[PDB]
Design a protein around this ligand. Structure first.
Ligand SMILES: CCCCn1cc[n+](C)c1
Ligand SMILES: CCCCn1cc[n+](C)c1
Ligand SMILES: CCCCn1cc[n+](C)c1
Ligand SMILES: CCCCn1cc[n+](C)c1
Ligand SMILES: [Au+]
Ligand SMILES: [Au+]
Ligand SMILES: [Au+]
Ligand SMILES: [Au+]
Ligand SMILES: [Au+]
Ligand SMILES: [Au+]
Ligand SMILES: [Au+]
Ligand SMILES: [Au+]
Ligand SMILES: [Au+]
Ligand SMILES: [Au+]
Ligand SMILES: [Au+]
Ligand SMILES: [Au+]
Ligand SMILES: [Au+]
Ligand SMILES: [Au+]
Ligand SMILES: [Au+]
Ligand SMILES: [Au+]
Lengths: 172, 172, 172, 172
């Protein structure tokens, strides 16, 4: 037992490890998306930059979870990072919809983690999740919903002009 | 009777109170409009900012009227601020048309107030209305008419691209 | 159903709309108070400034709640803003006591909202209320209690000198 | 007839000369008041400064009227400046009340002048009076009413402490 461990349940430790893996997977998905839009036959530079930024942010979230694991005296156990389900994301609108789905999945995982922490009476872990993750997820989901709405209204994905102008004016 | 009151008719005092209520109502309408465009399924940020600015300006106008009431020795009597007639404003173009209607209604109220002040031989009140309200209303009405004209020409509300580009280039 | 909505109960949405209306009502009450002290027969400028600042702060709180409603995929429904119960607030001390009562009422509403959010297992909403509203209310209530205590000790409301000096030294 | 005169009625010219005399008289009254509070047995320096400032402002108003008279091609005819009715103003509160009376008298004269200008269809003169005199009078009357209210509430004129503290905190 760690000399620092106090009020840290084994279930919480396992759930934190699972969340670390999920965040790394999300970072990988965003990396794939970013370099899809860097292809010469897609060529939407600002979409690529947006998704690369999201990938790096996901990596930061995973690293913060690992730091938390060590702070509380838990032990990090890493697992395979599965490859993204898709190789070709087919458009800016489709990529935004996939990102919205992914962010809502991550949010659901975080909500389950918070429920577990509440059940184990771990106020520090609950506060950590609330302060560093829940509002970030809400903001990300709202932003992605806004992007999807605007792309749909502009006529994407059929109108390539819509995605070009969205890339220039919203993501630029 | 107030120690400062001079050449201030009771009818003018009542009309000023009515105008205060009308300005507060206009502020409320603009607030509703602003947060309609903040919805995830509307998502026109610059429309939202424009209407929030208009809401705050209307509040400032109401406060200036209250200051005038106290300056002349009248007594402020506040009333319920009625909720806006609409919950869903349905588009940028429709919201601009509604704002044009509202601003013309406020202008008509101000013109009636000026007529009352003229009939009561209250040059200070006439000058107050002329200096602080009439040209502001004319400018606001002209600007809203310009916005409506441009949105109609661009193809709004059917073309969501038109409203997106108007949001970026005119209101941005 | 909104594309962004997740773990947001209908009861929470309704309670948020009620809280929006309550905050707007509080802003209206503070506006009335502020322009009572601007009267020529009251003439306590710093009381007026204090209550005007409180009114604007209440408006900001209402707008933050509306932003939250949109973030979570709820839909804002506005209602009439009822006029303040009083037209004449009768003194600085009486106005401070009324403000204390109002702030405690708003705090009770926020506590009920937090209880509802806890019952619906909405950690994001609980954290929102805790972070942005609860401590602000505690601080406001403490400040108003301090003001009431000092005004009472100085001999208000009977001693107009007490209210004049409190206006100059505490609120100035 | 002056080479510049146009749409300037003789009645308006005479009324302007009367207003010049009234403004000079008001300046004289304020000068008397100012040096009453400079007496060693009164000794309220900030009251003296306040009334000296008012005296100089009245002189400026008279000079602006003379400039207007020359601009429109009228001819200035000066008259005796009568001495103030009082040599001893008896207190700060009494002086403020006398100043309020004087400012309301000047305002009534200006309103009669504006009525005359309106009857003679002299829009330039009406605008001159509105822009440079009417709101200044309203503000001065409101300020003097505020001062009287505060001095009365503090316990003046019986409480010399009230006038001392008003001199320090309001007029200082
Ligand atoms: C597997 C998640 C699919 C999300 N989604 C919805 C619509 N689109 C184009 C993608
Ligand atoms: C009640 C005021 C209606 C104004 N108006 C005109 C056209 N549109 C779309 C709105
Ligand atoms: C209706 C709330 C009344 C609060 N209250 C208490 C004492 N005073 C002067 C006011
Ligand atoms: C001749 C004008 C008198 C004005 N007045 C009213 C009360 N006090 C003390 C002075
Ligand atoms: Au796939
Ligand atoms: Au896919
Ligand atoms: Au997907
Ligand atoms: Au997808
Ligand atoms: Au409607
Ligand atoms: Au409507
Ligand atoms: Au409308
Ligand atoms: Au409309
Ligand atoms: Au009441
Ligand atoms: Au009350
Ligand atoms: Au009350
Ligand atoms: Au009260
Ligand atoms: Au006298
Ligand atoms: Au006198
Ligand atoms: Au007098
Ligand atoms: Au007097």
């Amino acid at each position: 037992t760690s000399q620092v461990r106090q009020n840290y349940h084994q279930d919480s430790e396992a759930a934190i490890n699972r969340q670390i893996n999920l965040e790394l997977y999300a970072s990988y998905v965003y990396l794939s998306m970013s370099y899809y839009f860097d292809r010469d036959d897609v060529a939407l530079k600002n979409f690529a930059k947006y998704f690369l930024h999201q990938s790096h942010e996901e990596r930061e979230h995973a690293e913060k979870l690992m730091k938390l694991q060590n702070q509380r005296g838990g032990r990090i156990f890493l697992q395979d990072i599965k490859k993204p389900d898709c190789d070709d994301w087919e458009s800016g609108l489709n990529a935004m919809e996939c990102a919205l789905h992914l962010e809502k999945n991550v949010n659901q995982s975080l909500l389950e983690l918070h429920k577990l922490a509440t059940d184990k009476n771990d106020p520090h872990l609950c506060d950590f999740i609330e302060t560093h993750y829940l509002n970030e997820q809400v903001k990300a989901i709202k932003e992605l919903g806004d992007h999807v709405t605007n792309l749909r209204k502009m006529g994407a994905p059929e109108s390539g002009l819509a995605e070009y102008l969205f890339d220039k004016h919203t993501l630029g």
